[PDB]
Amino acid sequence: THCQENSETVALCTPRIVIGNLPDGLAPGPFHELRTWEIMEHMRLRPPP
Amino acid sequence: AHEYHNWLRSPFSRYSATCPNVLHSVMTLAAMLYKISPVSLVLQTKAHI
């Protein structure tokens, strides 16, 4: 981003820490639900309790 | 820690710690104890198992 400091506009780079901080336009909620279905399947829990 | 001299190794733990708690899990943990003696081999294959 272009952060606004006091009368200057220095650039600000910061790491995304998790996968969830990716935007909706590149990683939508339905994709996350469909991925966590697979993660729930991998632990033999695709029928959840 | 005598794992190689044991009767049940780490695959039994790593399957039993993630199975669902249905009765079929009890059945498959039971029938994973089939012996691989030659006489158990012919006894298994003579009944189409």
Side-chain angles (χ1 to χ4, degrees):
Chain A
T1 182
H2 277 272
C3 163
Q4 178 85 291
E5 198 35 52
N6 45 1
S7 59
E8 59 261 356
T9 318
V10 303
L12 174 64
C13 167
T14 179
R16 314 192 187 274
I17 306 308
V18 302
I19 200 158
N21 290 143
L22 276 184
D24 190 15
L26 303 179
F31 156 70
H32 288 285
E33 297 181 15
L34 197 146
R35 175 199 166 204
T36 196
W37 266 123
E38 174 267 357
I39 305 150
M40 198 194 317
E41 198 285 329
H42 177 38
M43 309 317 180
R44 305 283 318 274
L45 294 177
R46 191 259 178 272
Chain B
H2 297 287
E3 186 181 285
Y4 292 119
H5 293 64
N6 261 11
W7 272 74
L8 270 71
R9 268 77 164 265
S10 51
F12 283 101
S13 88
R14 269 198 33 87
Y15 177 59
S16 44
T18 183
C19 63
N21 285 162
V22 194
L23 179 144
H24 188 61
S25 166
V26 182
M27 304 310 105
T28 179
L29 268 163
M32 274 168 57
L33 272 64
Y34 270 117
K35 322 201 65 183
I36 325 148
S37 147
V39 314
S40 56
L41 261 181
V42 59
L43 259 285
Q44 276 193 45
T45 178
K46 274 268 188 178
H48 274 60
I49 297 315

